[PDB]
Design a protein around this ligand. Sequence first.
Ligand SMILES: CC(C)(COP(=O)(O)OP(=O)(O)OC[C@H]1O[C@@H](n2cnc3c(N)ncnc32)[C@H](O)[C@@H]1OP(=O)(O)O)[C@@H](O)C(=O)NCCC(=O)NCCS
Ligand SMILES: CC(C)(COP(=O)(O)OP(=O)(O)OC[C@H]1O[C@@H](n2cnc3c(N)ncnc32)[C@H](O)[C@@H]1OP(=O)(O)O)[C@@H](O)C(=O)NCCC(=O)NCCS
Ligand SMILES: CC(C)(COP(=O)(O)OP(=O)(O)OC[C@H]1O[C@@H](n2cnc3c(N)ncnc32)[C@H](O)[C@@H]1OP(=O)(O)O)[C@@H](O)C(=O)NCCC(=O)NCCS
Ligand SMILES: O=[N+]([O-])c1ccc(O[C@@H]2O[C@H](CO)[C@H](O)[C@H](O)[C@H]2O)cc1
Ligand SMILES: O=[N+]([O-])c1ccc(O[C@@H]2O[C@H](CO)[C@H](O)[C@H](O)[C@H]2O)cc1
Ligand SMILES: O=[N+]([O-])c1ccc(O[C@@H]2O[C@H](CO)[C@H](O)[C@H](O)[C@H]2O)cc1
Lengths: 201, 201, 201
Amino acid sequence: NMPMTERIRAGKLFTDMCEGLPEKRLRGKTLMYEFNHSHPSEVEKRESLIKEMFATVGENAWVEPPVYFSYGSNIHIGRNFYANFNLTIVDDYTVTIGDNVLIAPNVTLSVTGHPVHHELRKNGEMYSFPITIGNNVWIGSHVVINPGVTIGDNSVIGAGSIVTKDIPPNVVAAGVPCRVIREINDRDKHYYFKDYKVESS
Amino acid sequence: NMPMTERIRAGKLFTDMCEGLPEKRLRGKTLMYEFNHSHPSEVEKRESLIKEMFATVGENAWVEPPVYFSYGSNIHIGRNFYANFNLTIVDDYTVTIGDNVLIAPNVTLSVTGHPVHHELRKNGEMYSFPITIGNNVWIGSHVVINPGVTIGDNSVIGAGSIVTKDIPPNVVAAGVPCRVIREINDRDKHYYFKDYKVESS
Amino acid sequence: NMPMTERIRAGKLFTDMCEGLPEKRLRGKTLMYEFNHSHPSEVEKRESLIKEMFATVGENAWVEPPVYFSYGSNIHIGRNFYANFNLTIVDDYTVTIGDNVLIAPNVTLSVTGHPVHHELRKNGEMYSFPITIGNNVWIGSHVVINPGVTIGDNSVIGAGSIVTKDIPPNVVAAGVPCRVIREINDRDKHYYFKDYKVESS
Ligand SMILES: CC(C)(COP(=O)(O)OP(=O)(O)OC[C@H]1O[C@@H](n2cnc3c(N)ncnc32)[C@H](O)[C@@H]1OP(=O)(O)O)[C@@H](O)C(=O)NCCC(=O)NCCS
Ligand SMILES: CC(C)(COP(=O)(O)OP(=O)(O)OC[C@H]1O[C@@H](n2cnc3c(N)ncnc32)[C@H](O)[C@@H]1OP(=O)(O)O)[C@@H](O)C(=O)NCCC(=O)NCCS
Ligand SMILES: CC(C)(COP(=O)(O)OP(=O)(O)OC[C@H]1O[C@@H](n2cnc3c(N)ncnc32)[C@H](O)[C@@H]1OP(=O)(O)O)[C@@H](O)C(=O)NCCC(=O)NCCS
Ligand SMILES: O=[N+]([O-])c1ccc(O[C@@H]2O[C@H](CO)[C@H](O)[C@H](O)[C@H]2O)cc1
Ligand SMILES: O=[N+]([O-])c1ccc(O[C@@H]2O[C@H](CO)[C@H](O)[C@H](O)[C@H]2O)cc1
Ligand SMILES: O=[N+]([O-])c1ccc(O[C@@H]2O[C@H](CO)[C@H](O)[C@H](O)[C@H]2O)cc1
């Protein structure tokens, strides 16, 4: 009728116990395990590992272990990427991160959800909607980005926010659920934290 | 007068550095360590490890390591249980999980609390009130379930909510503190996510 | 002109890929790794490990692994300190915890933040502001403490609150963002949980 991997790209409900899906997760979870168990001095091994576990990684990437994901091969990353401890990405489908992105500790990305009505999820049915993170975005600690959410370039997501809707570019959004609190103006070019200014030359 | 293990069941303040409580945690914490450090392929080992660490597990159970708990012998799970990375269960007392429950990444269940007045908790004193999760319950990412809470059947707990009170069955609840936002009606039988419908068969 | 480490203490923007900073992070991430991968029965090793990785530790301390930090040597802890699973402390600068402090599972402390304007953080520039936690402080699960924050003695930070502002002593604070909800009175000396009193004798 309609293979399982096609329902995924169509945004329809599906299950993932076939078509080599399980085998893919294994290869992935395997690489992830090597990475999470590598010694802090195994810098080279860690470097090539990330290049192999993610679908696409730009130059100057650095991920602080542990890192958790479903396949890993559905995650595409740009340049100068940086993620602190416990980054979790549920990538049953595509996850794209722009350039110069910064992710604080314990952040969680999920393109997958489950039908709310217990009827549609009897067999653990799920749906997947890609997540797009712009360039020069900065995610706070303990943030949670839900399915099909887009974060516009240059935005900032406060610590602890639950993002369930796209966030426009050039704004500071935060809250549960996440909401735009204000746009990044030129004052932000002088004041970097509370009452701290930054002199020009 | 009244032994420590009896205060626990009576919901009174207690400490746990005696009566074998320490020993119990050591056995539990040992199996947990073997589980968490287990290679992705060690599927059979993993399957028996969970059977030996939880007081009760039903058929078709799956727990994505790492998992964290205090004893593991105070956790009782039904059938077709599924939990993602970093589930954490502080089980100084009973925690009962129903049938076909789904647990997203980084969730924390805790039956233990500390008295608010620093006086009463001079020695780390604590109290424990059992948590009960109904059947077909779906818990979002980064949720926190507090002592004595009861989640009714078929309910959904949005991502990031702090549940501090009983959640009735058949509702979608969320927020900090978690509040019921709506009852699950028949429209949810048709619309699974946002504007996505699902044709009959 | 003005060395990177001096800007840190001055609270100016800085980057840390020099002046042995990276090297320092390695020694720390090394001890940290030994700690997190240590077997539950390695009680003595665990104990000398926490003495060696933190700047200062008071007697009767206990940290349930895993534990995550940046350097570890900028962290100062008092007496009878207890931390549950997954405590994250980003310590690019001083972090001070007082006496009899209780931290629940999955808490994140960070003295570092990034300038909101993508121009100032083109190179991942950062700023660090020391965190100070009073005596007899109990932090609930999944809380996040942002830079420069100060929590007064005897206070309780409810589960899931994001602390962006100083919390006065003797208060129950909670919320996103954390807000004072009430003062700890004398009723808190009789009632410990909901409707549970404690017979003085
Ligand atoms: C977003 C952030 C950078 C600053 O936002 P800002 O506009 O410059 O700061 P403000 O104080 O002016 O914020 C305005 C209001 O939003 C609130 N607020 C701040 N951060 C918030 C957050 N994460 N969630 C919800 N509300 C938040 C403030 O309490 C303030 O309250 P008020 O309106 O009653 O006065 C900071 O709040 C933050 O959370 N940073 C993430 C830090 C982190 O996770 N670091 C980890 C190491 S990289
Ligand atoms: C709860 C959920 C399933 C959908 O709830 P729903 O009723 O079908 O969705 P709605 O958009 O109609 O929600 C209504 C409002 O609540 C808000 N809301 C949604 N999720 C929320 C959450 N987790 N916390 C707080 N508020 C939330 C919405 O932003 C919306 O705002 P509005 O009233 O201003 O329009 C979804 O929000 C969610 O969080 N799912 C968890 C996903 C997850 O953790 N997946 C991990 C992989 S299994
Ligand atoms: C803070 C705490 C100790 C109790 O606060 P309290 O004043 O004694 O309790 P109350 O029920 O009177 O709280 C008053 C209100 O705040 C709300 N509230 C409680 N905890 C909250 C939290 N963490 N965040 C936001 N709101 C919260 C309550 O729902 C209540 O609602 P109402 O005004 O509509 O009635 C408890 O809520 C808590 O979260 N403890 C942390 C537990 C934990 O993380 N344990 C891990 C193992 S150590
Ligand atoms: O409970 N079930 O029956 C059930 C069985 C398999 C499931 O698949 C799993 O879901 C995870 C998110 O929650 C990830 O998407 C993971 O990659 C996927 O295999 C989800 C639920
Ligand atoms: O800080 N103390 O003195 C102190 C000493 C021992 C404590 O016991 C511990 O608490 C944990 C939750 O926070 C779990 O309940 C764990 O099983 C219990 O042994 C809690 C606090
Ligand atoms: O993205 N960058 O270019 C970049 C490079 C190095 C950075 O340093 C790191 O930041 C962490 C918090 O997010 C901790 O402060 C850590 O100790 C620090 O070395 C932060 C960002």
